[PDB]
């Protein structure tokens, strides 16, 4: 859900 690390629910992140 965030923009930083990998890929989350609906964003290019996770934490």
Distance CA 15, CA 12 (A): 10
The number of CA neighbours under 13 Å toward the Cβ of 11 is 8
Q: Which distant-in-sequence residues (6+ apart) come within 8 Å of 10 by Cβ?
A: 1
Paired tokens of 15: 């934490």
CB neighbours of residue 9 within 10 Å: 8
Q: Which distant-in-sequence residues (6+ apart) come within 8 Å of 1 by Cβ?
A: 8, 9, 10, 11, 13, 14
The structure was resolved experimentally with NMR
Helices assigned H by DSSP within the chain: none
Q: Tokens 């690390």: give the residue.
A: 5
- Collapse the DSSP code of 12 into the 3-class scheme (helix H, G, I; strand E, B; otherwise coil) and give the result: coil
DSSP conformation class of 2 = -
5-11 long-range contacts (CB < 8 A, ≥24 apart) are: none
């Amino acid at each position: 859900l965030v923009v930083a690390v990998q890929a989350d629910w609906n964003a290019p992140g996770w934490f």
